[PDB]
Structures are given as structure tokens and as C-alpha cells.
Coordinates of C-alpha atoms and ligand atoms in Angstrom, one line a residue:
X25 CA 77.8 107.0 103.2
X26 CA 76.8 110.6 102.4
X27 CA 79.1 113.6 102.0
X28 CA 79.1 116.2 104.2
X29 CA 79.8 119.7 103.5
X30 CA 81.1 121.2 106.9
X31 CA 84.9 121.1 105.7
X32 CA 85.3 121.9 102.1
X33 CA 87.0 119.7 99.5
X34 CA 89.1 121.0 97.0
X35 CA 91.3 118.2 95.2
X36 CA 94.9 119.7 94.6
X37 CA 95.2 120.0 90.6
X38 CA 97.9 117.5 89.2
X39 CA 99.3 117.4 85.8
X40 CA 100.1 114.7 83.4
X41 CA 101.5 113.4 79.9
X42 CA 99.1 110.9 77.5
X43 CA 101.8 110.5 74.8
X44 CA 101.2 108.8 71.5
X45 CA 103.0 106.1 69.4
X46 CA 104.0 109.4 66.4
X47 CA 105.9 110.9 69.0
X48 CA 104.4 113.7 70.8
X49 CA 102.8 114.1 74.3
X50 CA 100.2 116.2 75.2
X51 CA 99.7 118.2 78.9
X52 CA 96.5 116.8 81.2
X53 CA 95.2 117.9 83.8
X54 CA 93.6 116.2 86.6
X55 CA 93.8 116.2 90.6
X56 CA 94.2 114.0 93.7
X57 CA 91.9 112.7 96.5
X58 CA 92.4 111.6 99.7
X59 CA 90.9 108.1 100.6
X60 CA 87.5 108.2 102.6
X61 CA 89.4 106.3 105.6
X62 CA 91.4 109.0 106.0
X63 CA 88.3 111.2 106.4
X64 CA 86.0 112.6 109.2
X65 CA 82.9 110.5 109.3
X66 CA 80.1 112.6 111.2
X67 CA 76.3 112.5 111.4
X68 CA 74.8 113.9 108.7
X69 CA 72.7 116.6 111.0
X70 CA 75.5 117.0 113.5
X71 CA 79.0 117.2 114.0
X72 CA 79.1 114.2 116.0
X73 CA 81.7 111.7 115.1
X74 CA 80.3 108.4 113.7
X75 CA 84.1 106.8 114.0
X76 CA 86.4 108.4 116.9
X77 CA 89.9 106.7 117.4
X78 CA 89.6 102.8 116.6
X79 CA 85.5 102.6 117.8
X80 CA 83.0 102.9 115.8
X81 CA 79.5 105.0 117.6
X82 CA 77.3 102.3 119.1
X83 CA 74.3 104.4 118.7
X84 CA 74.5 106.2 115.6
X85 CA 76.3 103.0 113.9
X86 CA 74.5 100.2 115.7
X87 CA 74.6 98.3 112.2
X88 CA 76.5 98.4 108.8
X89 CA 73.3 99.8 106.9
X90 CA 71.8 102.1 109.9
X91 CA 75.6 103.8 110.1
X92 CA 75.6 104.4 106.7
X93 CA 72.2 106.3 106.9
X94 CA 73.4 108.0 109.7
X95 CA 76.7 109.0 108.6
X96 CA 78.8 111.2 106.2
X97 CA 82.1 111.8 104.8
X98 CA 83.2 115.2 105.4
X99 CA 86.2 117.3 103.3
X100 CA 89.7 117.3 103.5
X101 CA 92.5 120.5 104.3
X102 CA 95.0 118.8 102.3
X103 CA 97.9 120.2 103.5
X104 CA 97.5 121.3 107.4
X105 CA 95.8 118.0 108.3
X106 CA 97.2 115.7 105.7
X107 CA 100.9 116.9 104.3
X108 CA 99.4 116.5 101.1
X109 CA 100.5 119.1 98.4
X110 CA 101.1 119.5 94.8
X111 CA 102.6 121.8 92.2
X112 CA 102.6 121.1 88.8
X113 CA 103.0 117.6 87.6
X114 CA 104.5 117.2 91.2
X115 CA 103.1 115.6 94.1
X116 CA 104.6 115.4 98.0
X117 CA 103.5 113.4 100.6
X118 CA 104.3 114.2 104.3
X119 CA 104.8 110.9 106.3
X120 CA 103.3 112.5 110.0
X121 CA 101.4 115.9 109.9
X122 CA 100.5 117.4 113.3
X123 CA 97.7 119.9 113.2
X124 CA 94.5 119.7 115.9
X125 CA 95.5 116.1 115.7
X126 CA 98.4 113.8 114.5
X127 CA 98.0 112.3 110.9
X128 CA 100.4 109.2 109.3
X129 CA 100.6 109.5 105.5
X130 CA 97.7 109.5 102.9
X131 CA 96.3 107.0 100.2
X132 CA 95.5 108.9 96.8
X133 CA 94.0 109.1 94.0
X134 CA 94.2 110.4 90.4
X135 CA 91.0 111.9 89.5
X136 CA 89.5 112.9 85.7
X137 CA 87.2 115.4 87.3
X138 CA 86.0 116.4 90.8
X139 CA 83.6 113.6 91.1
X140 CA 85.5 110.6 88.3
X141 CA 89.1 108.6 89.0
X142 CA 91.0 108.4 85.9
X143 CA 91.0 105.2 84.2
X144 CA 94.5 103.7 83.0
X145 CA 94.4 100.2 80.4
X146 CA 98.1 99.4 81.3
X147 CA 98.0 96.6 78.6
X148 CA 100.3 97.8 75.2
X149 CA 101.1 100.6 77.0
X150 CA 104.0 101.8 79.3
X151 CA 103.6 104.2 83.0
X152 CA 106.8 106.5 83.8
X153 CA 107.1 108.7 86.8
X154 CA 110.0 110.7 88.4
X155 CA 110.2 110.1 92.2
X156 CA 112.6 111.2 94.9
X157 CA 112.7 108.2 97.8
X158 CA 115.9 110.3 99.8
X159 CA 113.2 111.0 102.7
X160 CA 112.1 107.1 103.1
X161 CA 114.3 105.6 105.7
X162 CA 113.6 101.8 106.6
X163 CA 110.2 101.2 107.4
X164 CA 108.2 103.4 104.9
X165 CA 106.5 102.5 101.8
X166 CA 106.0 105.3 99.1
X167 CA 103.7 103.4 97.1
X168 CA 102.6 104.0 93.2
X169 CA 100.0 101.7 92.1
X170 CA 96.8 100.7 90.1
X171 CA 93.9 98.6 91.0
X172 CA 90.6 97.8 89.1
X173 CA 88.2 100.2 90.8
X174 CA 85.2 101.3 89.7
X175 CA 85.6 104.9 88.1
X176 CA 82.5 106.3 89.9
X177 CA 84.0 104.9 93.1
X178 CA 81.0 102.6 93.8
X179 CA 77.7 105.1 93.2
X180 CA 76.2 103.2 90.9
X181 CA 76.4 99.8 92.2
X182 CA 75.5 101.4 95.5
X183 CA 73.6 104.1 95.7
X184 CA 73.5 104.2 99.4
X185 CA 77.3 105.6 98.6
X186 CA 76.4 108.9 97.5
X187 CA 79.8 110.4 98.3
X188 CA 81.9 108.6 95.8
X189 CA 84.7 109.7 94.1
X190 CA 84.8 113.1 95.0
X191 CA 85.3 111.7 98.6
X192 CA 87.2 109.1 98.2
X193 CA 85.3 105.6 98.1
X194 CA 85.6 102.8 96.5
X195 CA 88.9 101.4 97.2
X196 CA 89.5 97.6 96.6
X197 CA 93.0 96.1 96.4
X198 CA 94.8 92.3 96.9
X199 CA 95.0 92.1 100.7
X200 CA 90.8 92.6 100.3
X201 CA 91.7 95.1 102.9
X202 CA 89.2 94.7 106.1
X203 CA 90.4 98.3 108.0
X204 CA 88.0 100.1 105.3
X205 CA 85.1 102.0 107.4
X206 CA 83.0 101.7 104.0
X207 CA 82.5 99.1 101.3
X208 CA 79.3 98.9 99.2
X209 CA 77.5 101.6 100.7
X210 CA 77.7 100.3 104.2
X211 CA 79.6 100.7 107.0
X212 CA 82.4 98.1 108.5
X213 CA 81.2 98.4 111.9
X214 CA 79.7 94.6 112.4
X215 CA 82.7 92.5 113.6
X216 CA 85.0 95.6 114.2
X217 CA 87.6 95.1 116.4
X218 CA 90.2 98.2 117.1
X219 CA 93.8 97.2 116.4
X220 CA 96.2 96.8 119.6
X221 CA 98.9 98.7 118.5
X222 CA 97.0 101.9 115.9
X223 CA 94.8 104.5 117.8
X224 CA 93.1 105.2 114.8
X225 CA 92.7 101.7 113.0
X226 CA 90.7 98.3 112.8
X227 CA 89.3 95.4 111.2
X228 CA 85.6 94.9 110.3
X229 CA 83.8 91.9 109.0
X230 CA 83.9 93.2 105.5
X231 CA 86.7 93.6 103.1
X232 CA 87.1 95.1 100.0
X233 CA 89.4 92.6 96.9
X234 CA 90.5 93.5 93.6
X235 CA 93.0 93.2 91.0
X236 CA 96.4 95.2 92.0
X237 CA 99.6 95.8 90.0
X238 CA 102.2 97.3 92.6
X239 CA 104.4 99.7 90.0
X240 CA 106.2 100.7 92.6
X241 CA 106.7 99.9 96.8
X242 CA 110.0 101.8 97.7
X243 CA 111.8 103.1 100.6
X244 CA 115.7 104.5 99.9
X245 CA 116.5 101.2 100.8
X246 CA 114.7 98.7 98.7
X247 CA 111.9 98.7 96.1
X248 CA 109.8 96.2 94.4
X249 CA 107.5 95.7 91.3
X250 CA 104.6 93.2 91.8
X251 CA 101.8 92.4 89.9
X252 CA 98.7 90.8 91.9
X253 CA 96.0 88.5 90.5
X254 CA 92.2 87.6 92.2
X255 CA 89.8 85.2 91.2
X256 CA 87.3 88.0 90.3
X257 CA 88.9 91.2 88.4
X258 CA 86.9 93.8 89.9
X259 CA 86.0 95.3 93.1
X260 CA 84.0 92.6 94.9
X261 CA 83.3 92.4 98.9
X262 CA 84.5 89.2 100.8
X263 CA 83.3 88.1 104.2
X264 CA 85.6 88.2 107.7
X265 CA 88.5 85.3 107.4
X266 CA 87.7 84.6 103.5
X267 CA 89.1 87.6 102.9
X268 CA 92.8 86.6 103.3
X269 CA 95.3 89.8 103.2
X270 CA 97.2 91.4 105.8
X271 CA 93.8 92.2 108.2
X272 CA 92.8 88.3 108.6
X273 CA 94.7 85.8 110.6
X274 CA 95.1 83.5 107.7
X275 CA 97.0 85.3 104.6
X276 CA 95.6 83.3 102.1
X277 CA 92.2 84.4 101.3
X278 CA 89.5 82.5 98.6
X279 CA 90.3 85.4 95.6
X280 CA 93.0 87.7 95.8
X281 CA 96.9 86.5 95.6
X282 CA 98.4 89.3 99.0
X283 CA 102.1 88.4 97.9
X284 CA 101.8 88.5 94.2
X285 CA 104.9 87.7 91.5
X286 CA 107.5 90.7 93.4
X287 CA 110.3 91.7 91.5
X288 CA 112.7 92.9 94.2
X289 CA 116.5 93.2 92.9
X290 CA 118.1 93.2 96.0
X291 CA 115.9 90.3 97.2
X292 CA 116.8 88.7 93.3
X293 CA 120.5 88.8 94.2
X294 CA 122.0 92.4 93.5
X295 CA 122.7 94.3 96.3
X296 CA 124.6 97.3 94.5
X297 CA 121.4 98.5 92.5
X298 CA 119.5 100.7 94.2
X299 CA 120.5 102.8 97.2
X300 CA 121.8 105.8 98.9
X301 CA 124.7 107.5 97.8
X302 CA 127.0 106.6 95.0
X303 CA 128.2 102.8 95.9
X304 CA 125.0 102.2 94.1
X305 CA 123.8 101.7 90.8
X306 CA 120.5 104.5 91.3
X307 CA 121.6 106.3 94.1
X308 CA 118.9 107.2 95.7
X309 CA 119.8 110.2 97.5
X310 CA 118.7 111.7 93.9
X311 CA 115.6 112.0 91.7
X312 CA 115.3 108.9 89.4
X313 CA 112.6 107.9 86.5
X314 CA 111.0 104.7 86.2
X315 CA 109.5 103.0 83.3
X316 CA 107.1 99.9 83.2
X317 CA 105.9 98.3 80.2
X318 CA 103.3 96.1 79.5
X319 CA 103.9 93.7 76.8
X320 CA 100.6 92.4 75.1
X321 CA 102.2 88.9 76.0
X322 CA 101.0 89.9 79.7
X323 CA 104.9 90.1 80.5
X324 CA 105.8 93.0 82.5
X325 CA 109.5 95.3 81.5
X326 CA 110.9 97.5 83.5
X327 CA 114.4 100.3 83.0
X328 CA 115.2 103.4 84.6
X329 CA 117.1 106.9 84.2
X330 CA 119.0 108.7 86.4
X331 CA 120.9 111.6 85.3
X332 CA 120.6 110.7 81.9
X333 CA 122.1 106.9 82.3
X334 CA 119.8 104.4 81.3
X335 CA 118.9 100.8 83.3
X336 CA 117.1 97.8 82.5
X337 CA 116.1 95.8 85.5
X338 CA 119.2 94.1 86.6
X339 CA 119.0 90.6 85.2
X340 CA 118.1 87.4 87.7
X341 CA 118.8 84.0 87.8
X342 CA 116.5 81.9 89.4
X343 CA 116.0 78.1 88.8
X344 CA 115.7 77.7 85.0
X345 CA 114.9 81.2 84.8
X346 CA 117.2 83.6 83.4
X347 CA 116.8 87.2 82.5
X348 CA 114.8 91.0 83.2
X349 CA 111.5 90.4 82.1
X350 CA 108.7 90.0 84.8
X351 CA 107.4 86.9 83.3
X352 CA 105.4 83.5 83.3
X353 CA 109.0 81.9 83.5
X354 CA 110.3 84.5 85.9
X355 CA 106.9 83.8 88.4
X356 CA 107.0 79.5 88.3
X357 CA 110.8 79.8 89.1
X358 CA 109.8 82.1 91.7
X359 CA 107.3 79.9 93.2
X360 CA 109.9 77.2 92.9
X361 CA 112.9 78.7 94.3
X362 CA 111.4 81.0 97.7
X363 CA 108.2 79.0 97.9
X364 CA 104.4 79.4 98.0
X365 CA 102.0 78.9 95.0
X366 CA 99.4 82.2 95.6
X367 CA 100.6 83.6 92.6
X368 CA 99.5 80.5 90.3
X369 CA 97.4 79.6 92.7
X370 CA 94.9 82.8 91.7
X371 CA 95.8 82.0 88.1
X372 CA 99.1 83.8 87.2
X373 CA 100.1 86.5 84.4
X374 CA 97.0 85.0 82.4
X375 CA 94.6 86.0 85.3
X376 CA 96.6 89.4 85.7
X377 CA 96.4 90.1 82.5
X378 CA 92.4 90.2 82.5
X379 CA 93.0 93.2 84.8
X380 CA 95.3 94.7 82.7
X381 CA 93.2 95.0 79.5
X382 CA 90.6 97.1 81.2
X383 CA 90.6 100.3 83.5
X384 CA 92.7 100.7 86.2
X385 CA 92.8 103.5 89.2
X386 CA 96.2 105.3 89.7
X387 CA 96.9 105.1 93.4
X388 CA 100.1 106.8 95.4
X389 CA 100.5 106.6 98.9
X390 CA 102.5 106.8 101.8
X391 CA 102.6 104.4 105.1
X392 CA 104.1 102.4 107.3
X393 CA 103.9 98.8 108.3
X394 CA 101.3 98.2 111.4
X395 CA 101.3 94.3 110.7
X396 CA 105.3 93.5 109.8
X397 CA 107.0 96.9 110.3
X398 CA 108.1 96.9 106.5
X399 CA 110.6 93.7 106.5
X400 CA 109.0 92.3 103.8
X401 CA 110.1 94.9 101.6
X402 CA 113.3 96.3 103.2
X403 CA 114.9 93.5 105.5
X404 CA 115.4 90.1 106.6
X405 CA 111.9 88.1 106.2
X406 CA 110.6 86.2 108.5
X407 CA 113.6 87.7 110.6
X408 CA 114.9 84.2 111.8
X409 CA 115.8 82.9 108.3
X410 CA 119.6 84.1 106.7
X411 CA 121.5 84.6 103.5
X412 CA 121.4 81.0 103.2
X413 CA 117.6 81.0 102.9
X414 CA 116.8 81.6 99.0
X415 CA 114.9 85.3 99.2
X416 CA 115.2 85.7 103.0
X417 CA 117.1 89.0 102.4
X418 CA 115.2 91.8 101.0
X419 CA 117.0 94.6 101.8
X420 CA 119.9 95.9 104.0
X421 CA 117.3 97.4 106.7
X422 CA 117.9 95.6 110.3
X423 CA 115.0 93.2 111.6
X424 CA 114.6 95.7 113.8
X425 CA 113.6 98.6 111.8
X426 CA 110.5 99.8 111.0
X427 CA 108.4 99.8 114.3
X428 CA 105.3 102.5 113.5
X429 CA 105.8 104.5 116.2
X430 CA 109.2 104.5 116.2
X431 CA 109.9 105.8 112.8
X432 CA 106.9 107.7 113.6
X433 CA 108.8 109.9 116.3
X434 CA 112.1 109.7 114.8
X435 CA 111.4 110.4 111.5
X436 CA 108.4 112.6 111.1
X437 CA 109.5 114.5 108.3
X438 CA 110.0 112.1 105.8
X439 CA 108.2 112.7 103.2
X440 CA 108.1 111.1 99.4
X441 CA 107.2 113.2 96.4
X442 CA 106.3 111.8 92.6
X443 CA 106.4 114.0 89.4
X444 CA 106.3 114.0 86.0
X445 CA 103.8 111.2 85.5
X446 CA 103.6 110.3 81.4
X447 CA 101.6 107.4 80.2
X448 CA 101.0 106.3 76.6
X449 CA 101.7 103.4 74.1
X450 CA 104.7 101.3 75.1
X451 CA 108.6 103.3 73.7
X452 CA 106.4 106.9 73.9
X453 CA 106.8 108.1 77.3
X454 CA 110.4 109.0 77.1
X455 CA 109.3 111.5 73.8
X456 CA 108.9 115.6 74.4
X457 CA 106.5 116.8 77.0
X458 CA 103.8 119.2 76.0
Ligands
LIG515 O1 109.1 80.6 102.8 N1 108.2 81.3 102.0 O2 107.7 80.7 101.1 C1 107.9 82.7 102.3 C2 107.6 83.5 101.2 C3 107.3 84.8 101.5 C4 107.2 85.3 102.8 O3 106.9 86.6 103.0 C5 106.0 87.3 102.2 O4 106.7 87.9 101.2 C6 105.9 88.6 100.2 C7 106.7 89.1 99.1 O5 107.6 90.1 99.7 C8 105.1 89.7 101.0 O6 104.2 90.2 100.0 C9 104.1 91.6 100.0 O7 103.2 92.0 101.1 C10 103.1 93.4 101.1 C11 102.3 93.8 102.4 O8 101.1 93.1 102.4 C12 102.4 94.0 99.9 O9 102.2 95.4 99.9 C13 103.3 93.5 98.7 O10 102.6 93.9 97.4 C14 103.5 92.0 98.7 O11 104.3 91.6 97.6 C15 104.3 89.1 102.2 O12 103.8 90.2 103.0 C16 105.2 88.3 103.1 O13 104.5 87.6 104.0 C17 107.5 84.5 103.9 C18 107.9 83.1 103.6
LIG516 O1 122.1 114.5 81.8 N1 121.0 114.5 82.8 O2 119.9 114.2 82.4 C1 121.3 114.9 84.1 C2 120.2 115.0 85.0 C3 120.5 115.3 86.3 C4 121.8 115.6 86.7 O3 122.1 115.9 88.0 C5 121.1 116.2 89.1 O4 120.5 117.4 88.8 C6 119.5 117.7 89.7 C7 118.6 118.9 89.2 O5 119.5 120.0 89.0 C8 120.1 117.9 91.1 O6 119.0 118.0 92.1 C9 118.9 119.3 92.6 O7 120.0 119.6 93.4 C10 119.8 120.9 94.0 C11 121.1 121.2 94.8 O8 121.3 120.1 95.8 C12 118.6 120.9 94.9 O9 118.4 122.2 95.5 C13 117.3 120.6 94.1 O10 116.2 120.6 94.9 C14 117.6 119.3 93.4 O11 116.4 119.0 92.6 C15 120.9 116.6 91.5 O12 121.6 116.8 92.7 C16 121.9 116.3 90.4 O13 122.5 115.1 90.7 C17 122.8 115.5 85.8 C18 122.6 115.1 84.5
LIG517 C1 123.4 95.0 89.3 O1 122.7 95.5 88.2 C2 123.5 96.5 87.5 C3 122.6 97.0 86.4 O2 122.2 96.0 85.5 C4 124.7 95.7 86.9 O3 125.5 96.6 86.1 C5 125.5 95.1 88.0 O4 126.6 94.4 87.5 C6 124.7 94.2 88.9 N1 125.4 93.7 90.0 C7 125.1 92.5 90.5 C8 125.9 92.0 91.7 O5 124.3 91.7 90.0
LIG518 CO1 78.2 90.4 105.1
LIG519 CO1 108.7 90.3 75.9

């Protein structure tokens, strides 16, 4: 696709610490974008929509390469159409914004200039961020993440994407999500079919798989740290069904690993860590900082703060395993104990780490669950298992939470907000800001 220029864009600034190992940290300064899915998508001589609702235009997108001739990515109003503000090192995200029309949640990106995404190597080095999850009932996903994008957001390999970063493109993560309107410079119209329950969603023939390491999925209820291999590091398209992910009837797809190596502590046993109120704990009613480490090993750590108290991740026993570190031990004992092999089957911490040592996008988002209402992260999963099943229970969240447009009505102001990002060499981040 093109851009457009009919709505301006104007990426809300957002700050940031790079710290170093002799102990200082130093101010950046960077900026956000919304995701081009999020996006109007018009002619380029018109105002007429090339996507409206879940249906793609017949006539001006009759085919994936015609549509993208035809059609452009237009700007974003940030905060009346998308609840998307910032201030500072802080960032909110509103779950439903009404405006001329009714918007759910936003995917985002850190940017190193108005048309460039930051690049993160996570390997030997350590992410913190402050968030507040006391606006995330059961059902929402405030989501921090990285995935191996392409820093350009695909211009270069495509140069019939001349919107890129600025607008948005690009995007690529482990479900080799299928609902993106773009990939590769072309449209997702062939084999689109509108989603039964999501005015505004579908699934094309095309999807979109690359390397994904989930800092952070988190509701007030339950959060999880999950790192995700794929066969092929980088962004790459996959066709219909091969694919795998949430968008294809068949999970298990030919690269990426959808369910990854999840650290979940409620799920690992301890249901006092992390929730609302002081029963817990990180009460998360309150502001709390989390720290992830990346060991060159390719092991993952992981400890917190909250009001000046210090965490590790509680320590699991699982199988054989025993300990805090998200590891090759921790992942086989995993595998072992719940079930499934996706993990090793896309080849593990070893594979993982080959996304690790290069350049990563820094993601945050906010959604809810179309496909399985959140019960992955926050309930019981499938919802006919029990206690008795070894990681059934995720979370204290009925099996009944979580339905989109329930939460939707009942809980349109929730809202998550992030803040104080530092990143630098691991045992830094916790140093002076500057
Ligand atoms: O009996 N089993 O073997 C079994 C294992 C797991 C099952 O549910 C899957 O659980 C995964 C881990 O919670 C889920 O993966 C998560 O999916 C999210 C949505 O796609 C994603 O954002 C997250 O990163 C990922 O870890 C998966 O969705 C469940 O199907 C069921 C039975
Ligand atoms: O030793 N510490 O590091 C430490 C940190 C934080 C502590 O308490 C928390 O302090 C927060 C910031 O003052 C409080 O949050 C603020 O509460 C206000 C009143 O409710 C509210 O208006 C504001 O938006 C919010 O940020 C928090 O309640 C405290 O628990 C203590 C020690
Ligand atoms: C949960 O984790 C915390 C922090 O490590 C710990 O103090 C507490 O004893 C743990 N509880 C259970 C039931 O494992
Ligand atoms: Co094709
Ligand atoms: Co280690």
C-alpha cells in the first residue's frame, strides 16, 4: 500500500532509558505508531474506502496486487479515534474509544524516527518497564512484546509498500497472523472471509510469521512471560492453513511455535503472586516494575519491584525441573508435564535465541480475545479440564469471562498504561535515570 495524506499522522513522542554496564542511563527519545490494520484504507484519488467493516471493495480490491495499487493507508487521530496517548516516558491505552465510530484497543509501536522502529538485541541485555494492570479485568490482554520485524517495516523488500513504518506495516508475529489487510506489499483480500463474531475483522489467505518473545501478557488477574520460536527468524509470508496460529483451523502451522515456552505463576502453581489487593504478593491494584533478563545461555530471568520490595519469579517445580529461570530444563519439563511438543518442535531456546541476537521491534498493545475470550491466560483451559489436570488452571477468571462484547460494554474504560521503559546491559536498568 501507499500512504495517504487526508488525515495527518503525528506519532505521540515517548521517552526512554539506554543504560550502560558503568552505571548511568541516558534519556531517549522516540514515539509510537499505530498498526496499519487499525488504519483507514482508501483509494489513493478518493476517499472511498478500500476495506469497510469485515469486506474488502470487490472493485477497487479485485486482487491482492491490484488493491494495493489502488489503495492507501491514511493517518491516525491518536487520541479521539484510538485512546491512544502519551506523556513522558508514559504511555495509556484506552480499551473501547467511541468517536464517529467505535474503536477496541490499539497495537503499537516504538519508533527511532517518524519513518524507522527502534531495534532492541535482547541478548546480554535486560528490558524493565513500569505498568499499571488495575484497569484489566478478565478478558483483556495488555501486551509488551518484541518480534523480529524489519526496521523499515517492509519498504525495501517491497517496494510496492511505500507506506512503511511511518504507517504502520510490517507486522509479523508467531500466530503468522492471517487478519492482516497487508503483507509484502499486497493486499489480504484473496481468500478473505469476514469473522462471524468481529464487525471489523477477518482472515485472508496470507499471513504474516516471525520470531516473538511475549515480555509481558497481563490482565489484573494473571500474566505470563513466553518466548516463541519459528523455523525462519524473520518476517516471512506463509500461505492459508500452513500458517498455523490462532486465524487457521489447525493451530500448528509449518514455522512458527503459537503457544511458545509460557511462564505463567499462577498456572506454575502459586496462586498468591500476583493480583488485586493485598492478599497478593504484587498487588496489582498498584504500579509494579518488571525486569527480564536475557542470559547469553539463551535462558530467560525475570524479578520485580513494587514499592521498593524486590521479587524473583516465584520458583516452580515441574517434573525434574526445579527453580526461576525460564530455561531449556524449565521448557522439556513443560512439554512433559501439560503436554504438546511446538516448543521443541520449532527448535527450542537454541532456535529462540537466533532471534534474540539480532534486532527486535518493541510492541505494546491492548485487546481482547475474539477466538478464546482470554482463558488461556486468565482461566480454566480448555474449560472442561480441573485442578486435577496439570496446567488446566491459569488464573482465577471464571470460564465464562471474557466474551468481546461483553467486556466490551461492561468495561469500556479500561484502559492499561506502561512507563518508564529502560533497556541496557543485563544488572543496569535498575541504575539512575537521566
Ligand atoms: O493438553 N494440552 O497439552 C494443552 C496445552 C495447552 C492448551 O492451551 C494452549 O495454551 C497455550 C499456553 O497458554 C496458549 O498459548 C498462548 O496463546 C495466546 C493466544 O494465541 C498467545 O498470545 C500466547 O503467547 C500463547 O502462549 C494457547 O492459546 C492454548 O491453546 C490446551 C491443551
Ligand atoms: O519505597 N518505594 O519505592 C515506594 C514506592 C511506592 C509506594 O507507594 C505507592 O506510591 C504511589 C505513588 O505515590 C501510589 O500511587 C499513587 O496514588 C495516588 C493516590 O491514590 C494516585 O492519585 C496516583 O495516581 C498514584 O500514582 C500508590 O498508591 C502507593 O502504594 C511506597 C514506597
Ligand atoms: C509465591 O511466590 C512468592 C514470591 O516468591 C513466595 O514468597 C510465596 O511463598 C509463593 N507461594 C506459593 C504458594 O508458592
Ligand atoms: Co500466495
Ligand atoms: Co543462568
Amino acid at each position: 500500500q501507499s500512504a495517504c495524506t487526508l488525515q495527518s499522522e503525528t506519532h505521540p513522542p515517548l521517552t526512554w532509558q539506554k543504560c550502560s554496564s558503568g552505571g548511568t542511563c541516558t534519556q531517549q527519545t522516540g514515539s509510537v505508531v499505530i498498526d496499519a490494520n487499525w488504519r483507514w484504507t482508501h483509494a489513493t484519488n478518493s476517499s472511498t474506502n478500500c476495506y469497510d467493516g469485515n469486506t474488502w471493495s470487490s472493485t477497487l480490491c479485485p486482487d491482492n496486487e491490484t488493491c494495493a495499487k489502488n489503495c492507501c493507508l491514511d493517518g491516525a487521530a491518536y487520541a479521539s479515534t484510538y485512546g491512544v496517548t502519551t506523556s513522558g516516558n508514559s504511555l495509556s491505552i484506552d480499551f473501547v474509544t467511541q468517536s464517529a465510530q467505535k474503536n477496541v484497543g490499539a497495537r503499537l509501536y516504538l519508533m527511532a524516527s517518524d519513518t524507522t522502529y527502534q531495534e532492541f538485541t535482547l541478548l546480554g541485555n535486560e528490558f524493565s518497564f513500569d505498568v499499571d494492570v488495575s484497569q484489566l479485568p478478565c478478558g483483556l490482554n495488555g501486551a509488551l512484546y518484541f518480534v523480529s520485524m524489519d526496521a523499515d517495516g517492509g519498504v525495501s523488500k517491497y517496494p510496492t509498500n511505500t507506506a512503511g513504518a511511518k504507517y504502520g506495516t510490517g507486522y509479523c508475529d508467531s500466530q503468522c497472523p492471517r487478519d492482516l489487510k497487508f503483507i509484502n506489499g499486497q493486499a489480504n483480500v484473496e481468500g478473505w472471509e469476514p469473522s462471524s463474531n468481529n464487525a471489523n475483522t477477518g482472515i485472508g489467505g496470507h499471513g504474516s510469521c516471525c520470531s516473538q518473545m511475549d515480555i509481558w501478557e497481563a490482565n489484573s488477574i494473571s500474566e505470563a512471560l513466553t518466548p516463541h520460536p519459528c523455523t525462519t527468524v524473520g518476517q516471512e509470508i506463509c500461505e492459508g492453513d500452513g500458517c498455523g496460529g490462532t486465524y487457521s483451523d489447525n493451530r500448528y502451522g509449518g514455522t512458527c511455535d503459537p503457544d511458545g515456552c509460557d511462564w505463567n505463576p499462577y498456572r506454575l502453581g502459586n496462586t498468591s503472586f500476583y493480583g488485586p489487593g493485598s492478599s497478593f504478593t504484587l498487588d496489582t491494584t498498584k504500579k509494579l516494575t518488571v525486569v527480564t533478563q536475557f542470559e547469553t545461555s539463551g535462558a530467560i530471568n525475570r524479578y520485580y519491584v513494587q514499592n521498593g520490595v524486590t521479587f524473583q519469579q516465584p520458583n516452580a517445580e515441574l517434573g525434574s525441573y526445579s527453580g526461576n529461570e525460564l530455561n531449556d530444563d524449565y521448557c522439556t519439563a513443560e512439554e512433559a508435564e501439560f503436554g504438546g511438543s511446538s516448543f521443541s518442535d520449532k527448535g527450542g531456546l537454541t532456535q529462540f535465541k537466533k532471534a534474540t541476537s539480532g534486532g527486535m521491534v518493541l510492541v505494546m498493545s491492548l485487546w481482547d480475545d475474539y477466538y478464546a475470550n482470554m482463558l488461556w491466560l486468565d482461566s480454566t483451559y480448555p474449560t472442561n479440564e480441573t485442578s486435577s489436570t496439570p496446567g488446566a488452571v491459569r488464573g482465577s477468571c471464571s470460564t465464562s469471562s471474557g466474551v468481546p462484547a461483553q467486556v466490551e460494554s461492561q468495561s469500556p474504560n479500561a484502559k492499561v498504561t506502561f512507563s518508564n521503559i529502560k533497556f541496557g546491559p543485563i544488572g543496569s536498568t535498575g541504575n539512575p535515570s537521566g
